[PDB]
């Protein structure tokens, strides 16, 4: 049973759903452990409850009958999760993340080089939408000619057709790489082994589709919302980053705490318990609202303000917590750092369009509402 999580807050505007800080403050102050009769869900907003739901799989299972949304990795609890996680993790080593940085830098340099003389840019079409698709295509090892945005657009049934077309495209590339191994994700998934078990070629195609669904639109949203913040939240932050070019990672971590909305994951209660202060029964569904708990003043001082120097920022739960903690988190942080650093090198100052209207430039997405357009005036020094 697909649970329509959109019906819990019932937002009055796309703009509110895009940045629901008023609703987070209401739930944290008045209703932090909230039973929603219409969806038959429990809803938790406080940092210590959200963290417990995400990680304590003995009590809060990822593999229940009801959900908020090809290996089903995200739907497995330990012990069955260990093999799937280990085989996919073979493509996300410390060595690969080190080797990816100069490749991702090249891609960012080319995207920014295309807009370097622009008086005005559109973050979405010029940067946030193409960049994570161009990156994942390079990291997969796709032929240079195919270097792909189309796929994830369509991968959003339209869905049956698109998945069958991706499969026919990639299946012969995996077979080819099995005989012709290179430093790319597909080659690392071919060589992966757990207790003598390996992926089949078909499983590797599915693994790449899971990585596309996990890592493209999420990263696009995170980048667009970071640039949104520089225009609309702390308008002095961009200047601070220009003045000290080592601050990019701190800025990325604060934009993942402050401007990624809405982050929520569901679990199914596995055993009766009152760990969240209320009696729950086996089969109950709990939604953990990570974006809300990222503004819990018990963990984050001055939580409704941008502060890239807040020493707790690295504790945000935008990537989850526990066994399912985002496999892509290092890559996501690297992509956001590299695109921000390339942008800072090109542009001395950015300004919003006085006439930009948010409501007409938001569309429904898996995370709530996403920018369709984000204009800015840019300057060079
Ligand atoms: C800003 C970007 C991203 C965000 C906000 C994000 C968020 C998340 C979250 C919250 C989970 C945990 C789900 C849960 O507990 O139920 C997760 C899992 C995962 N993410 Fe990410 N993600 C991002 C980028 C990426 C990228 C770039 C990749 C890969 C290229 C990726 C691959 C995955 C995978 C494979 C899992 C499943 C791990 C498991 O279930 O063991 N993600 N992501």
TrEMBL record:
Pfam families xref list: p450
Superkingdom: Bacteria
UniProt keyword Membrane present: no
EC number(s) given by UniProt: 1.14.14.-
Keywords: Heme, Iron, Metal-binding, Monooxygenase, Oxidoreductase
Similarity field: Belongs to the cytochrome P450 family.
Protein's name according to its UniProt entry: Cytochrome P450
């Amino acid at each position: 049973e697909v649970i329509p999580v959109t019906e819990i807050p019932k937002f009055q505007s796309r703009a509110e759903e895009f940045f629901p800080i008023q609703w987070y403050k209401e739930m944290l102050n008045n209703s932090p452990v909230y039973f929603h009769e219409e969806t038959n869900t429990w809803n938790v907003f406080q940092y210590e409850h959200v963290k417990q739901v995400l990680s304590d799989y003995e009590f809060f299972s990822s593999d229940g009958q009801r959900t908020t949304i090809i290996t089903n990795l995200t739907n497995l609890d330990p012990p069955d999760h260990r093999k799937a996680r280990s085989l996919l993790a073979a493509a996300f080593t410390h060595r690969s993340l080190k080797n990816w940085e100069p490749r991702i830098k090249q891609i960012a340099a080319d995207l920014v080089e295309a807009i370097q003389k622009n008086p005005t840019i559109n973050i979405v079409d010029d940067l946030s939408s193409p960049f994570p698709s161009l990156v994942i295509a390079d990291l997969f090892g796709v032929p240079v000619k195919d270097r792909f945005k189309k796929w994830v657009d369509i991968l959003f049934q339209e869905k049956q057709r698109a998945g069958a077309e991706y499969f026919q495209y990639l299946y012969p590339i995996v077979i080819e790489k099995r005989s012709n191994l290179s430093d790319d994700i597909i080659s690392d998934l071919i060589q992966a082994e757990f207790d003598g078990e390996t992926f089949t070629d078909e499983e590797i195609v599915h693994a790449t589709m899971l990585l596309l669904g996990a890592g493209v639109e999420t990263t696009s949203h995170a980048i667009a919302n970071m640039f949104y913040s520089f225009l609309y939240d702390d308008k002095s932050l961009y200047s601070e980053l220009r003045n000290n070019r080592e601050l990019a990672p701190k800025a990325v971590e604060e934009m993942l705490r402050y401007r990624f909305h809405i982050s929520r994951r569901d679990r199914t209660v596995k055993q009766d318990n009152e760990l969240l202060g209320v009696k729950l029964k086996k089969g109950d569904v709990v939604i953990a609202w990570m974006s809300a708990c990222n503004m819990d003043e018990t963990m984050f001082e001055n939580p409704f303000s941008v502060d890239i120097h807040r020493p707790t920022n690295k504790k945000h739960l935008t990537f989850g917590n526990g066994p399912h903690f985002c496999l892509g988190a290092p890559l996501a942080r690297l992509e956001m750092k590299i695109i921000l650093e390339a942008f800072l090198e090109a542009f001395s100052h950015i300004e919003p369009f006085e006439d930009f209207e948010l409501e007409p430039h938001l569309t429904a997405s898996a995370t709530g509402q996403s920018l369709t357009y984000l204009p800015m005036t840019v300057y060079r020094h």
